[PDB]
Amino acid sequence: MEKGGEALKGLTFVITGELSRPREEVKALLRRLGAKVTDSVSRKTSYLVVGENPGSKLEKARALGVPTLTEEELYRLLEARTGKKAEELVGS
Fold this sequence. Notes:
This protein has 92 residues and is α/β, with parallel strands linked by helices. 29% of the residues lie in helices and 11% in strands. The chain is globular, with a radius of gyration of 14 Å. This is DNA ligase.
C-alpha cells in the first residue's frame, strides 16, 4: 500500500548549455523520475547534473562556491527506482 514515491524528487538539475553530450535523453528520464530540471542560473537553481568529464559543465560543475549535483546519485535512484537498465540494451 505504501507507494513511497521519493527516489530523488524535490531536487532540480540544470545542464550547462549541453554538458558536451545528449542532455535531452538524460533529461527525458529525469522528468520521468519526478524530479525537475532547468538550463539557466539565477539563484533558486545552482544544481547541475555532472555527467560528462570535460563537459561545458566545468563552469557550474567546478563552481568556485556554487553547489553542483553529482549525476551519479541521479543515475542511482533512477535504476534503483526504474528496476531496469536505463540504456535498455548493453547486455548483462
